[PDB]
Amino acid sequence: TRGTGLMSANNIIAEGIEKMGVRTFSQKEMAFNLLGLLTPEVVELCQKS
């Protein structure tokens, strides 16, 4: 991800990596993920294993 104070130093090669057939998320994009990880579907998937 990009803009956070963990990789922002590395922010300037993202464009370079995507060429290898990869995606780099905005934090708002990586936001969509773990929120979609609360979904009432999963929530069982963990309440089982």
Binding site: A9, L34, L37, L38, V43, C46, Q47
Partner: protein
Amino acid sequence: EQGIELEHIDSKSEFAHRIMLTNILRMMGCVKKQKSARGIETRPAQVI
């Protein structure tokens, strides 16, 4: 913590290890103790 290689490992890291690990544990080992008592065992806590 950046630029820290091995021989440069000291407190500031020994402090972090404890931020993430040895306190999240003690964190999670500190809600159950608040559930086990009240008997909550159908509304558990999903962890991320």
